[PDB]
Amino acid sequence: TATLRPYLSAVRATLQAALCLENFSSQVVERHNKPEVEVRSSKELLLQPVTISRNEKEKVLIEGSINSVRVSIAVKQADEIEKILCHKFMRFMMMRAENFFILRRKPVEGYDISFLITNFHTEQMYKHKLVDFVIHFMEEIDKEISEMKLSVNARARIVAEEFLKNF
Amino acid sequence: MILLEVNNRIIEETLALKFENAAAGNKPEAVEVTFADFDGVLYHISNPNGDKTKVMVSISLKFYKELQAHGADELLKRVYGSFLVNPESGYNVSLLYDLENLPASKDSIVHQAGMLKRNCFASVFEKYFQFQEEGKEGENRAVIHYRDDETMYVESKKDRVTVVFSTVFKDDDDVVIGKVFMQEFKEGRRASHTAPQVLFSHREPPLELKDTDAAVGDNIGYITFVLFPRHTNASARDNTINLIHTFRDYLHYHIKCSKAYIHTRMRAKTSDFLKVLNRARPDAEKKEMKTITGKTFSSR
Amino acid sequence: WXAXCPA
Amino acid sequence: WXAXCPA
Amino acid sequence: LMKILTERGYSFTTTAEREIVRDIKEKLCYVALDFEQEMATAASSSSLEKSYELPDGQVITIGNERFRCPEALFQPSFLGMESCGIHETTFNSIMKCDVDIRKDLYANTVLSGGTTMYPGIADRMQKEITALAPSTMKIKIIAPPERKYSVWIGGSILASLSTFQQMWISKQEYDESGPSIVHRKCF
Amino acid sequence: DIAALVVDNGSGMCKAGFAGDDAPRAVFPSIVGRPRHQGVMVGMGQKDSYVGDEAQSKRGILTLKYPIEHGIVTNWDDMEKIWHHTFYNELRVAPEEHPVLLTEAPLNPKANREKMTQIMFETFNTPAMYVAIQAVLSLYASGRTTGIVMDSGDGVTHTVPIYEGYALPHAILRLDLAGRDLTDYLMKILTERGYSFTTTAEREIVRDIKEKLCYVALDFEQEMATAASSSSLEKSYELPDGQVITIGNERFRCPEALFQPSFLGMESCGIHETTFNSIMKCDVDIRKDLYANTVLSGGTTMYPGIADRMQKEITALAPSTMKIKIIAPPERKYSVWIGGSILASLSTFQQMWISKQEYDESGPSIVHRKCF
Amino acid sequence: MAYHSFLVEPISCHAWNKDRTQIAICPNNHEVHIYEKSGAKWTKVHELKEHNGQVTGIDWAPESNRIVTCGTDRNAYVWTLKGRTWKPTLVILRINRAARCVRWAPNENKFAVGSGSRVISICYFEQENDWWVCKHIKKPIRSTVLSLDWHPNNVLLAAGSCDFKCRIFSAYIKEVEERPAPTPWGSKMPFGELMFESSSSCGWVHGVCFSASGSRVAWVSHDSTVCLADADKKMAVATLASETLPLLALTFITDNSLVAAGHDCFPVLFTYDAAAGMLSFGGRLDVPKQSSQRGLTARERFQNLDKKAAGLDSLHKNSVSQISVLSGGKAKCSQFCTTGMDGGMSIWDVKSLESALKDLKIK
Amino acid sequence: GRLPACVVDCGTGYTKLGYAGNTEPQFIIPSCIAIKESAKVGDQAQRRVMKGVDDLDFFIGDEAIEKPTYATKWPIRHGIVEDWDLMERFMEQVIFKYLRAEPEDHYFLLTEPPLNTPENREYTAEIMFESFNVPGLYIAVQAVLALAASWTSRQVGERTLTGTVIDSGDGVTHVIPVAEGYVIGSCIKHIPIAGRDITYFIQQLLRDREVGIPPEQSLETAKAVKERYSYVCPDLVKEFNKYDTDGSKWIKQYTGINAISKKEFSIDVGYERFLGPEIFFHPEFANPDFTQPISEVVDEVIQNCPIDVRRPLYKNIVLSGGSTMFRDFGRRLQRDLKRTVDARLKLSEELSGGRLKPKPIDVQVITHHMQRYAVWFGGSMLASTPEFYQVCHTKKDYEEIGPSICRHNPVFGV
Numbered sequence A: 001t002a003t004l005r006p007y008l009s010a011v012r013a014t015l016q017a018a019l020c021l022e023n024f025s026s027q028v029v030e031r032h033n034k035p036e037v038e039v040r041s042s043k044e045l046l047l048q049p050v051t052i053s054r055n056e057k058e059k060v061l062i063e064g065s066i067n068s069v070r071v072s073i074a075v076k077q078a079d080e081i082e083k084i085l086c087h088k089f090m091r092f093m094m095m096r097a098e099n100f101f102i103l104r105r106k107p108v109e110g111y112d113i114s115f116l117i118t119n120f121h122t123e124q125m126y127k128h129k130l131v132d133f134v135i136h137f138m139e140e141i142d143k144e145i146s147e148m149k150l151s152v153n154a155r156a157r158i159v160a161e162e163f164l165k166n167f
Numbered sequence B: 001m002i003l004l005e006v007n008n009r010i011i012e013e014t015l016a017l018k019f020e021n022a023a024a025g026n027k028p029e030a031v032e033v034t035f036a037d038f039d040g041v042l043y044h045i046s047n048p049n050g051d052k053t054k055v056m057v058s059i060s061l062k063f064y065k066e067l068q069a070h071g072a073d074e075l076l077k078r079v080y081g082s083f084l085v086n087p088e089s090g091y092n093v094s095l096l097y098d099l100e101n102l103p104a105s106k107d108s109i110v111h112q113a114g115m116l117k118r119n120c121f122a123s124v125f126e127k128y129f130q131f132q133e134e135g136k137e138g139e140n141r142a143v144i145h146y147r148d149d150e151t152m153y154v155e156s157k158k159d160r161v162t163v164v165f166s167t168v169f170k171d172d173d174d175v176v177i178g179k180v181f182m183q184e185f186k187e188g189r190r191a192s193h194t195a196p197q198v199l200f201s202h203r204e205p206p207l208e209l210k211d212t213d214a215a216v217g218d219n220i221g222y223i224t225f226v227l228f229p230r231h232t233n234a235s236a237r238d239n240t241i242n243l244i245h246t247f248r249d250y251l252h253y254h255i256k257c258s259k260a261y262i263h264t265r266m267r268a269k270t271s272d273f274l275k276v277l278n279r280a281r282p283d284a285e286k287k288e289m290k291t292i293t294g295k296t297f298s299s300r
Numbered sequence C, D: 001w002x003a004x005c006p007a
Numbered sequence E: 001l002m003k004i005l006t007e008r009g010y011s012f013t014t015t016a017e018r019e020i021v022r023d024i025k026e027k028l029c030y031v032a033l034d035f036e037q038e039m040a041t042a043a044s045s046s047s048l049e050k051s052y053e054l055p056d057g058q059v060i061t062i063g064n065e066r067f068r069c070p071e072a073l074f075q076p077s078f079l080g081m082e083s084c085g086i087h088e089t090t091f092n093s094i095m096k097c098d099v100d101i102r103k104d105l106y107a108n109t110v111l112s113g114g115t116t117m118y119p120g121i122a123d124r125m126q127k128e129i130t131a132l133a134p135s136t137m138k139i140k141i142i143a144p145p146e147r148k149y150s151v152w153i154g155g156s157i158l159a160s161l162s163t164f165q166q167m168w169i170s171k172q173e174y175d176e177s178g179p180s181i182v183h184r185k186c187f
Numbered sequence F: 001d002i003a004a005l006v007v008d009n010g011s012g013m014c015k016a017g018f019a020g021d022d023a024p025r026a027v028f029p030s031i032v033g034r035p036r037h038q039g040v041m042v043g044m045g046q047k048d049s050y051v052g053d054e055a056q057s058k059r060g061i062l063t064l065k066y067p068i069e070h071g072i073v074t075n076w077d078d079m080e081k082i083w084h085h086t087f088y089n090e091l092r093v094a095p096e097e098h099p100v101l102l103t104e105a106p107l108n109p110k111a112n113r114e115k116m117t118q119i120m121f122e123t124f125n126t127p128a129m130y131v132a133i134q135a136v137l138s139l140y141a142s143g144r145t146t147g148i149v150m151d152s153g154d155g156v157t158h159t160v161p162i163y164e165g166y167a168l169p170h171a172i173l174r175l176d177l178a179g180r181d182l183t184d185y186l187m188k189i190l191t192e193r194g195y196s197f198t199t200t201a202e203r204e205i206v207r208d209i210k211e212k213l214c215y216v217a218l219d220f221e222q223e224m225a226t227a228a229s230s231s232s233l234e235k236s237y238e239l240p241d242g243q244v245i246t247i248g249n250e251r252f253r254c255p256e257a258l259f260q261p262s263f264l265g266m267e268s269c270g271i272h273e274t275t276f277n278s279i280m281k282c283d284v285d286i287r288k289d290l291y292a293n294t295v296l297s298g299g300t301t302m303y304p305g306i307a308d309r310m311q312k313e314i315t316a317l318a319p320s321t322m323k324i325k326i327i328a329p330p331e332r333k334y335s336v337w338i339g340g341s342i343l344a345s346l347s348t349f350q351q352m353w354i355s356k357q358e359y360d361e362s363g364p365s366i367v368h369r370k371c372f
Numbered sequence G: 001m002a003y004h005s006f007l008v009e010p011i012s013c014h015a016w017n018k019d020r021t022q023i024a025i026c027p028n029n030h031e032v033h034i035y036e037k038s039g040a041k042w043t044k045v046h047e048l049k050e051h052n053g054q055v056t057g058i059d060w061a062p063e064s065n066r067i068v069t070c071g072t073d074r075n076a077y078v079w080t081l082k083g084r085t086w087k088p089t090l091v092i093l094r095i096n097r098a099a100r101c102v103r104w105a106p107n108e109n110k111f112a113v114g115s116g117s118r119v120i121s122i123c124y125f126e127q128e129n130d131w132w133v134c135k136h137i138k139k140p141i142r143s144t145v146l147s148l149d150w151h152p153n154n155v156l157l158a159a160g161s162c163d164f165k166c167r168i169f170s171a172y173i174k175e176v177e178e179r180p181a182p183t184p185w186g187s188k189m190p191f192g193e194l195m196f197e198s199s200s201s202c203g204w205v206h207g208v209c210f211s212a213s214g215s216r217v218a219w220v221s222h223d224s225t226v227c228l229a230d231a232d233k234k235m236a237v238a239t240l241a242s243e244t245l246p247l248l249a250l251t252f253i254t255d256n257s258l259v260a261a262g263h264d265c266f267p268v269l270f271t272y273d274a275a276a277g278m279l280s281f282g283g284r285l286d287v288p289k290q291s292s293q294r295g296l297t298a299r300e301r302f303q304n305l306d307k308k309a310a311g312l313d314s315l316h317k318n319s320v321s322q323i324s325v326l327s328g329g330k331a332k333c334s335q336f337c338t339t340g341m342d343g344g345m346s347i348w349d350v351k352s353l354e355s356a357l358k359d360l361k362i363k
Numbered sequence H: 001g002r003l004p005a006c007v008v009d010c011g012t013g014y015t016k017l018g019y020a021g022n023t024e025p026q027f028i029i030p031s032c033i034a035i036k037e038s039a040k041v042g043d044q045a046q047r048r049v050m051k052g053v054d055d056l057d058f059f060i061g062d063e064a065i066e067k068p069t070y071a072t073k074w075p076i077r078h079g080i081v082e083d084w085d086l087m088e089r090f091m092e093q094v095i096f097k098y099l100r101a102e103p104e105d106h107y108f109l110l111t112e113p114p115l116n117t118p119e120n121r122e123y124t125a126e127i128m129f130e131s132f133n134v135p136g137l138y139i140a141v142q143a144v145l146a147l148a149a150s151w152t153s154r155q156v157g158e159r160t161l162t163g164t165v166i167d168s169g170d171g172v173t174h175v176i177p178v179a180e181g182y183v184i185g186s187c188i189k190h191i192p193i194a195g196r197d198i199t200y201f202i203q204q205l206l207r208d209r210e211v212g213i214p215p216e217q218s219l220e221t222a223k224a225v226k227e228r229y230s231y232v233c234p235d236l237v238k239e240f241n242k243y244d245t246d247g248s249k250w251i252k253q254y255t256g257i258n259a260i261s262k263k264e265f266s267i268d269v270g271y272e273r274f275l276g277p278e279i280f281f282h283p284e285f286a287n288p289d290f291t292q293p294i295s296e297v298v299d300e301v302i303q304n305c306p307i308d309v310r311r312p313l314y315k316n317i318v319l320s321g322g323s324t325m326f327r328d329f330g331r332r333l334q335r336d337l338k339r340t341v342d343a344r345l346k347l348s349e350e351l352s353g354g355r356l357k358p359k360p361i362d363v364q365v366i367t368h369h370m371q372r373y374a375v376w377f378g379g380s381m382l383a384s385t386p387e388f389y390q391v392c393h394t395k396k397d398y399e400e401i402g403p404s405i406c407r408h409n410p411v412f413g414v
């Protein structure tokens, strides 16, 4: 859209300032190769967690590291119906978290969705296309949730007409 | 299934099985089946004092007191004849079928036995239909506690019958979707040229509930049907009673199917987002052709 | 419309 | 075919 | 019908066989009183099949097709047409008229034409209209015993009227005003 | 991913291969031979039914029978023989491990595809199959989602218009007129010159003569007057026994039957008028997009100078402002198969199979629900 | 000048021999693949398979023709070419975490392995027992050792770490070489000494490199900054903060100019002004190439219309991870090879690059 | 007051519905759903989006097999739900049409096979807690409830709490050793070979030999042939010989009705009388991955349990499920088990030196009056006790922790 343009430009510019990932083997365990932002084992391989917010309640928290990036998104939820629909939709997104290679089966507490892009995802898959996917999600999620809301309204109207027709 | 049905399946099944076993001449076996229904109704089909020849079907309702009022058993008596007996201890209505005195055409009595709850409701409801048919204004108006936290205020006038549902849902998601399902309920009168006047309110209770004990509050919704003498005549009052009886349960049913409806659209959009992600996976240069099972091709 | 004319 | 034309 | 018969295996292509197909349609087809129920019945039994004999000795049997042909009248979507069925057409034509008369038309719907000689079309039309029109009004489908020649019967009755002899287009009128006179002499 | 056999198996010639290639792995005429003389030399090995190229090479002592006629399977035993030869001899692959994408012409009897599914599931035990319409695959092969496909195979001709993917099923025009009728017509008209081919083994010779010498004349009457006033169009072909024959006027009289079936004693319109009618049956807002996306296919549209004839004929029937493009690629004969390999190699196509399990519980009546 | 893609998976590290006719790469697995230049095409000639985890450092000694490989299995191997096959000799590193980088000494008498155990392992030979032994430099280090580069005097050793610091240790082994000569870094050089330690406290150090004369030490940080410490000026630091993505590798093509690369995928050139003590962005070395588009077939159009409903203008399509000097040494270089995380190997040329861009001056 | 808890045992070939506290399930319907399916193109998640209210135009149970214009889909395969849209619709009509239960006033007791993946439990919890809003749920293993269904047919004083339950249903056969009331979970065995594999094998046998069977009923026949003329043989080759030499006695006739023209077809039931059940003692006949008979699997199950509970487990082998209703199934099972046990005991005696002759291990296979629905009645017991309302997952627990509350079952540790 055109009301999220500076917010999305800032988010995209912060995404490709992180996502400069490198291969790294663990220090606190013999031969494991684990994402350093998930284990939080070494405090020297962790960059500052940067927040980019459009208003009080829509934001992106980006936690960088040497071989991983965790991007948590707190989406706009205006009323209770949008909250229910956003919850169910994010849940149906988590369900397939092996088809989405950069997704995370559980969101970071306080945030609606979370992506975890390690270094293998930037070595075996296009980096700019991952950035584009994140920005496209942030662009289109509000529109899709609004269409869900309109679908619920239409279902309510059809149910009312199906009842009051028999009288 | 769009519209909820009024006949219970377990009663019909059990009584038809017992009547087939009795009509073929087999010796009767014991029966003790307890179950439930909508609105907290409790059924119990058993035998009186281990007498394997009689089957007693008892029902416990929530409008306990409104059915004990004088004249609230005209329909029950009229429809059930000699089957209506004294209630079993702990229950409210009770039918008693003797497996040796069953009349012919055993389908009709079972079709009327599966609608025991509908008939108990229509018996306490046709009182006001008659109070309106006989041309008397100001007849008795009551509050049927058809549930435990919701009420149905019935009033009969010279020219109409007003039914005010005071309704509230238990779960938070159900409350949030029910606000919508009840706001959009006046848009139904565009589907038929003859539908009762429906009014919805959740800011303040109607002026009918200011002298009565119908449930009120800031979390309750009020839905007023105004049934006119074209919906309460002696030929189209069966459908009207069925609908006014199953309205709340039908709304609850469709609120709970709305979620299974939305889940399909959410799966579709999830796949549509996966297709946008797929632009990040670099297309392979050569793939090995496999089999339906997944094993190597084993040939060119 | 509801009565008279369509709309 | 069965009716019309052969096949 | 020529198209759907290929489903069974019968291919009528030339214009000479269109007459055979028309004879089949005007001898075996019938309008169903409930399309979905008749479709479910014809798919679970053989009590709806009828055999017709081509004029060379070949005998064919048509089942489900018998009522899928006239059903197009009530669902033009089969023919890829966007327009509504004949029942909705009649109902809309009624609703186009003034209010006070919509009652009388409801009780005086008069079928006509050969295509309305399908067994069970009056009942289907009545059901559709009484499902569309309000419940208070009465629906009566005036399907005469004969309606193939009804237009001709009416034409005869009109021509035999004594007040009609002043409405003919006279030869002198045509020679005076040319053909276009037909736009003003005839309605 | 999984490897799925694509078996076109239209009338005339069976072309089978694997999904993902650019050409069918095995293409052979769908004929079945039967010996018509006594065996006298015992000990050399004998067979009672030759299939495909082997039946073609030994046609001198066989009665070639086509199992498919006008796009309809008329002898199911020979069809099973053809499929067995395709699976175990040409592709040399076990059929009980790969899905199968067969093709069928539009407006065929449902019993055809029903028995096809029953055979492919109960005889070869394929784990999944799918019966697609030929013209849709032909449009796949052309890499576009809008246009009218004009597929003229060996036994059937048909046109299917599609717009943005939404095929219009009420304007699909079928016409039982294709290479075999033209071959029989050539056999008929070759007598007037003096040559008589009358046995089913010589019909192959006539078919070779047709597909090597015959062509389509841009202006029929001018070409007739020309070849009838000068010996500059006569061509000489050598029979497989040394005899040479010379055909003149006949060269373009055989394929001309496609544009005016009054020669064969048929009433239906030509293929150009059939395509134009199919277009005119569609709505008015898409015709302009169909005119510029006409697609040819089938081996009967491989006649030299048929694209120009079709363009010149449609342009005479369409308004003078519509641009008529005849998209005839030089790989038109294999197009129906090439589109198949494109289709069976797609990701979502795995959700359109007819799984063996789904058939085991519903019988052959499932193809009408899973495949249009 | 050329570009050759050996594979689609990243290349961890590469090494060339003396006459630059063979290359040893890591296919992003346990094996080491030795390819040989045959005319214009490359052909794999050797596969060295002894490691348990993926190799992370390969180095090829030119004069002795011995390869050294260190991987994430906490082991190091020295491969010698017996007849036609490379046979490995195991080195006992005594580390408890994965190794990260390996570097031969200039004289090929010892080699340094930086590991993630917060130590550096100076390995040498014991011909009294045929025993590859190692000593440890572990005092001021507090994290992984990422990059190593030896001083031309065979003793000093530059090491970058994940503790944000670049250091210059003294790897003097008093049993394989003589006491070294005094350098402008310091006169006291016992084993494990600390001659220099940068003042940076931000960003890891991905690459360090000594000058051709051993008087300057340059390094690159994840902080996007490229720094150079000069020893003839009281060890003075000249820093340059870039406005692009960070760098991963660098080298000295002359005593005044550096060629770096990194997460930008194209090589850049920096220059050092000794008369002022400040770095200058010499500019991008590669000319932005226009990648030709291809028309889509029908099979590929439907394949990417069903499945999914170049962006980069350099030779490498992923970040460049290692830069080596092919020919010319570090005093006057003419060819440098870059390998990145896209399996490619770009053999650059300094003359052609200086010719293509006339706005490009090499100090 | 409280209302009885709903019990819904959802099996691959049949679902048993009831209210806890009764003696037998109120409904036993086929586990199938008839929905409108037409010829469409695209994915499955995309062609399932129905406009308007058309997603409620479906039927389940007995009413879904009669419908000839609908497409019948089976959501459960091998006991594991492979389709959750159809399963949600099936559950919503199970609750709102057959049981007529308001899902906010009744605790629910569903069932599962042993090797149900945890994500299936999480999806079931999500469905029952967020869509239907049950106040409590309990997902019990299927065979462990089948043990408490053999007590109604055995004499007083010998109703034990220890036994090996063998549950062979439509899609899965699992063996569960219960000891003193505690499910020995780390010894449970689970084989996906069951009734429906027998029905596929029998129809493939009939289709290779017989003629005249309508295709659209080729399965419906192979069930009436399997659940009517099928028995168990003591020996296979000897039975083939008995059928070959005296076919006039061992070969039966089956006469069915073609339900399109109402004509009658007749087929000969021959070898598939004994080859059907033989895939229990020869699982390679139907799935070449497994090669181990059921007697050997039961013996491994019992020989892995603790030592001093091995001898009672051999004494109370309780059969359950429909696929164990084959004539002389328990007899052949007990014969093979007795062979194995006696051979092992004699070997142990010989190795001991020959001084003691230990007590011969009593092996018994218990067929009872409730096998066809032995699971459900078990549930109807467990969901009728007070302690039931102490082991359910309350709605508060879900609202607090989430669906991961239902992630653990007694087959795996931690």
Ligand SMILES: Nc1ncnc2c1ncn2[C@@H]1O[C@H](COP(=O)(O)OP(=O)(O)O)[C@@H](O)[C@H]1O
Pocket: E022, E025, E026, E027, E029, E113, E114, E115, E116, E117, E118, E147, E148, E149
């Ligand atoms: N009994 C019938 N059943 C079905 N179709 C009929 C029947 N009678 C006539 N038709 C069809 O309806 C059309 C109209 O019949 P007709 O009364 O002759 O009007 P018109 O003179 O306009 O044709 C005819 O073309 C005929 O094929």
Ligand SMILES: Nc1ncnc2c1ncn2[C@@H]1O[C@H](COP(=O)(O)OP(=O)(O)O)[C@@H](O)[C@H]1O
Pocket: F010, F011, F012, F013, F014, F152, F153, F154, F155, F178, F179, F180, F207, F208, F210, F211, F212, F298, F299, F300, F301, F302, F303, F304, F333
């Ligand atoms: N290149 C060609 N030129 C002329 N005629 C051809 C050519 N190729 C094929 N034909 C003729 O077209 C006829 C039918 O085409 P074919 O591709 O066999 O149909 P199908 O695709 O159904 O097998 C064949 O009998 C053949 O003689």
Ligand SMILES: Nc1ncnc2c1ncn2[C@@H]1O[C@H](COP(=O)(O)OP(=O)(O)O)[C@@H](O)[C@H]1O
Pocket: H011, H012, H013, H014, H015, H168, H169, H170, H171, H172, H195, H196, H199, H223, H226, H227, H228, H321, H322, H323, H324, H325, H326, H372
């Ligand atoms: N008497 C019987 N003999 C043999 N097989 C049977 C019998 N009864 C049922 N079956 C088979 O068992 C299956 C149904 O049993 P059931 O215990 O309900 O399985 P589930 O509970 O998994 O649906 C069906 O496949 C049926 O063919």
Ligand SMILES: [Mg+2]
Pocket: F010, F134, F151, F152, F153, F154, F297, F298, F299, F336
């Ligand atoms: Mg073709």
Ligand SMILES: [Mg+2]
Pocket: H011, H012, H142, H168, H169, H170, H321, H375
């Ligand atoms: Mg079961």
